[PDB]
Design a protein around this ligand. Structure first.
Ligand code: CL
Ligand code: CL
Ligand code: CL
Ligand code: CL
Ligand code: CL
Ligand code: CL
Lengths: 441, 442, 440, 431
């Protein structure tokens, strides 16, 4: 069954520990669905889905400031182009191998297709370590790498972006060299600067979208983001604008945390408090403890899951929440939980909410805002226009809504809807249904 | 002289029956207009228009399930690109030949221009018979087809679709093979599934546009869909979603039909009844004969709904389904409006004869253009890399149809009736002709 | 220093007068700002900014009606592609040369970037003189010229347009051969007719954009078109629709002129009057004829001797000299906006500023057209046509954005000073993008 | 250094075994030359050489006769392209992986450049199993594979060929679908049928060159192909024997898969005709010997210039010494490194002339280059032309190892193949 499939795939390419785990975590969740609908099991769909459409390894030779020639290996996995062009990020890290990029692009194939946007799946990068390198060395590398990759990308083929090791600067260098060589001014990279093609709300995406998806499911029942106590963890793009958008909604947030402790404001955050926080902690670098002191707020060293709230918005790190912390919240009366980071809740902790009655929102769907806007950026570049914040926000909003409605039609008919299963399936279905109608290949 | 021009043109292809007829029917309506303003004969636009810009005939070789190799011929008539990229559906059928496709293409050219969209005129297909062919074969053919045709297509060059013989399954096959060879995700094919760029109103389009257009035609002559007897033929996208929209406008749809017979429900169709009709007819085997029995409705063994007294007829079945005989009955009964849902559902005789009796007649190029108009929306959505909501696609569709109405009225005689036969042809010819003069030569 | 940098730049182009003049007039205004923010003078931007990315010169050979083979030269100055694809019109005229096209494109760069729309900077044409040519000759030339240029153009590379000697007719002729040769529908030329992918409010563009901008400037300093008497100096698509929009805002337009003379309707302009005028000028040959039909006409004189509150030069470059500036200022002129290209002389311009008169340079007011041509590419990219209301709505908001942009980079004095505000705002967006996109 | 460098290179791919082992054999022989010449260690040249320019992994989805959809993985290791367009056949085999194709390409890069012809270097293939598949299945795979690979090839870019699992049949299918999709009738594949851009002498090539070369080295020291009896083993052995007869010699041995024929007078033009036509056409070596009366062994190294032309490691150190006992003086390989490492250095040290495989059986590769040359000229050379210019190429390869080397041809080949690759790689800036 599940074990046999993985064992046959392992044969194709062992030693890929990362990718082996990727295929395992995805298939496991889809199997209960594949049994119900064998329509997606035939014609070697799963066998073709695990196999990347195209993988590109190429030599990259540049020169450091010591006039010493350096040699690195860059990749770009054209994993899947079923829904749309290969959409994904580029990673510059010395510990990057094919297996890692192969698993990133794999999951990306689903996360992207889940955003309703016509985007494929693919990842890239190199074993280049940007740390210590001057701006010139990082540039010459981006160009030395682009002198080859430029022939493999395109506005309707592969549209990379940013990731670990590749920030707004690197994207600018790659997008620049791309434009010169090809002599084309189409959107080849997303996450660009506002000066040449970048999109607004770029950082505010993940945050706002989180509130929209939470609002989408809440109001679809008998509740809403109105006059509700909201606990929020973490401090960053995901948390900052999640706290703000939650304030634009009737809700009343009362928490925020860092790697150290957590601040508590029973009265609730204000447009000014959040501003004095971000400006003097997210850029100062910085500490959450020094914030509570300023505003005389109650600082706690430990996790804002102790305070009773109607909504919980975990936005810190993968597995930042556990079961025992959930038992306290449910006992109090929490009715909504949405993830901001990767996966703040464990399988055991998540099930503790669902079987309880609490509405849950996995990061696979909630924090989609980041990806959703990288797709809305391509949308702007397509119409030759420059959408203002207001216009972009309205689109990001509806996109987040269609993401919610996508999970609605999956698990279950009643009595309540499961977003964890609804999210895993949604992404697969669109990629699968599309991969079937287009034939072989 | 018209007969001198048509006979002159027919000289190039002395053996294209269906095409020489197309040029006539259109060039016969334009002649009176060519007299009004003779600037449309400036650079011999007539001879420039008639002659297709480019036609690619090629050899498609595949292998059936019997391990036998079957060779087949395919074409792609890229007729006009003045207003936009070549737009036309592919047709897989034994009778398919150059003359037919070239004829359908010339039709599509004006048909697309009339939809106020940046679309040219094209048409293609093959003599390949898909009937009784396993899915593997049809797929194996579509790919063998694209192995050659893919180079002649493009997102801004030629965007085929799906006609007779080429449905969603085939469209996906050609599109899929196109994407593989091209390594490009641009919109090269329309009529795609919602899984890879498809539109929402696509199926409801051709039907909706028909009702959207007809209601407009009626409203202008002090009439209206609501409260009048509506006859419908067929059970496909055209008929189903034409009946649906007809009901919402307060009308009473009486009949629906299959190749087998016609159902008569004078109690009027319903959101409930239609739902079942579409359900059973959705099945590949289902027949309307069973629909009548499930609702105790009158059935007609191998007949047409033209025998009943109706105010508004909506032929949405096959070509030449409404001959002179059936027309005589519709007219004598007191028909006051006839709109063409399907393509060329009426014959020349039955057409002009319908007009003389003061019967509002809306040609296919007009009302039936609702679908092609939506396919243009399918290209627009893909281009913006964003999928619109159903209410947006529908809204735009309605606007487009309303524009097509005014367009026909603007070129319809100043008499009791606009006569959309002359309107559609003129309004459609005007735009293509304008874009041909302004864009040098060639 | 500035002088050292200019003479260093003019080193490569010693006899490119217009180009050198263009670089100076722009660098002079930016220099003070360049001192405030050093980061713009670090990565050697200016030195790179001046040098065009790519300029193509090709031989165009056609045949006149005498069946006599004629030869001409054509260029396509593709200056900067930092913001977007090369945008700029084509110019057919004897005077046309690389020296001119360079400065026309160099300015088109900062101008297009000022309109927010993702458009680069370009400008081309030929020494070909359409004056005294049949359609066949013009067509045979347009097609012969596009025979080579078609390889350097693209919907996402270079989208030229029309200028002097290249009206709507030439656009279609070139776009046609482009369509034929490239077998591509994609938008490669703007200013097209509505017949084959043209945009609505194309002629109203330049005109409306002017009034929309001026209004924003007036409403900024407690003024407005309503009740104010305005002078218009032109007859083309600029003046025709500059007067039209002015009237709607409640302004009484007094003048309208050509190369011959000026007409003076003290009472003001009317929708009816304008219709007849724009129809008379359409027949070619006649503003003097206009005056006679309605009753005065100032032969061989410009409408700058008449008292007004707003002046809208929409005729030819350098039409408003110093002599005309002092007259306006004395009569009671409060604001002046440029409709055509550089209608006001440098000395005359600063003369208005020194007098405390609002001055909207052409680099911002003329944008009403280039922004609309950008909206045309936008409509074509979405594969559908916007209604007049849609185009006019986004065109209005764009001009307002251009005004706002100028306001932010304007002098903190009594008035904004749009000469610097516009010249700087257009430079920034180009600099930022050009910088963040490596080398090159 | 000796191991320091090798470890720094493998750190990028530990799981790759074949490639790691390949880099060692190639580098270990070059270290002396590198130590003597700083201009080749120079600018990270070695660190740029081991790294392949471009590798393309792609999904190939085909369908078998059971109407069952199958999935396979294919590659195209475009290693080096300094000298010219990537050269190297494709391999369809269940045991095919990147680590292998990457080591084959790394070797082919030097073997191709060793032929003095403007050819780059690269290998490729797929884990597709040819064995057990019909013609229709193989066709439908070669097409599904060529559906993506076509965009990565080209006459002036990458011209692949055939190898294990990929014979003249597959080369045809791929070349067909290539010309179809590309609409280009250039030379994108070598080893094409005579009916469409094929090159004469192609099969007689790998055999003739083996002799042309072994003769140039013998006439170098002053030797005669006659006197000393030559043992043989095949596609190359069949024409290697023939050529030796033209120089006037006494080839007295023809080895079977299991057994060996012994002759005294040697093979006459008619005797060979029987030996070759009867051996290949039929399902044996014993029948040939018995049809003539010649001796037969059951298992050719015991008898008194040895020309191995069968299996890899055909000659082991064991039977190797035996050659010394009876007085043989020269040896020349016919397949891909078909000689034991220990046996190799043994022969050399005994005053024996040993011509490596990268130089001997270069006739095949050199001729696949001649096929490209003919196609490019839009005309077909006669059997005389091809054989003639092949002879010159086999001579150039000889007096190339001489310059970088009883002249040690082993040390000469590995160096000559590197020198030209390095020179061009240095002259063509930093890419
Ligand atoms: Cl590094
Ligand atoms: Cl990014
Ligand atoms: Cl058939
Ligand atoms: Cl295209
Ligand atoms: Cl224009
Ligand atoms: Cl297999």
């Amino acid at each position: 069954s599940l074990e046999s499939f993985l064992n046959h795939v392992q044969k194709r390419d062992p030693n890929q520990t990362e990718f082996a785990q990727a295929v395992r975590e995805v298939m496991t969740t889809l199997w209960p669905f594949l049994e119900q609908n064998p329509k997606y099991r035939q014609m070697s769909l799963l066998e073709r889905l695990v196999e990347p459409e195209r993988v590109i390894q190429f030599r990259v030779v540049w020169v450091d400031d010591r006039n010493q020639i350096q040699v690195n290996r860059a990749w770009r996995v054209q994993f899947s182009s079923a829904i749309g062009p290969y959409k994904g990020g580029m990673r510059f890290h010395p510990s990057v191998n094919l297996s890692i990029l192969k698993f990133l692009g794999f999951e990306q194939t689903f996360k992207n297709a889940l955003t309703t946007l016509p985007m494929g799946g693919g990842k890239g990068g190199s074993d280049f370590d940007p740390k210590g390198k001057s701006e010139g060395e990082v540039m010459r590398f981006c160009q030395a790498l682009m002198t080859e990759l430029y022939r493999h990308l395109g506005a309707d083929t592969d549209v990379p972006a940013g990731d670990i090791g590749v920030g707004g600067r690197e994207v600018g260098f790659m997008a620049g060299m791309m434009k010169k060589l090809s002599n084309n001014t189409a959107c080849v990279f997303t996450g660009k600067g506002l000066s040449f093609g970048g999109s607004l709300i770029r950082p505010e995406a993940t945050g706002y979208g989180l509130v929209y998806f939470t609002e989408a499911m809440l109001k679809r029942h008998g509740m809403g983001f109105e006059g509700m106590r909201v606990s929020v963890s973490g401090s960053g793009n995901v948390a900052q604008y999640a706290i703000e958008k939650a304030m634009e909604f009737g809700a009343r947030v009362i928490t925020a945390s860092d790697s150290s402790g957590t601040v508590v404001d029973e009265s609730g955050f204000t447009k000014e408090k959040l501003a004095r926080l971000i400006e003097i902690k997210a850029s100062r670098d910085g500490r959450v403890a020094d914030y509570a002191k300023e505003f005389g707020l109650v600082y706690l060293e430990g996790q804002p899951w102790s305070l009773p709230v109607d909504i919980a918005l975990p936005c810190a790190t993968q597995n930042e929440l556990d079961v025992d912390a959930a038992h306290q919240l449910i006992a109090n009366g929490v009715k909504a939980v949405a993830e901001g980071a990767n996966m703040p809740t464990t399988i055991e902790a998540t099930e503790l909410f669902q079987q309880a009655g609490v509405l849950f929102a996995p990061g696979k769907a909630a924090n989609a805002g980041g990806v959703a806007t990288s797709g809305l950026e391509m949308a702007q570049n397509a119409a030759r226009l420059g959408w203002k914040a207001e216009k972009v926000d309205a689109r990001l909003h509806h996109i987040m809504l269609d993401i919610h409605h996508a999970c609605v039609e999956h698990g279950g008919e009643g009595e309540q809807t499961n977003y964890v299963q609804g999210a895993n399936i949604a992404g697969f279905v669109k990629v699968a249904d599309a991969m079937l109608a287009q034939g072989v290949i």
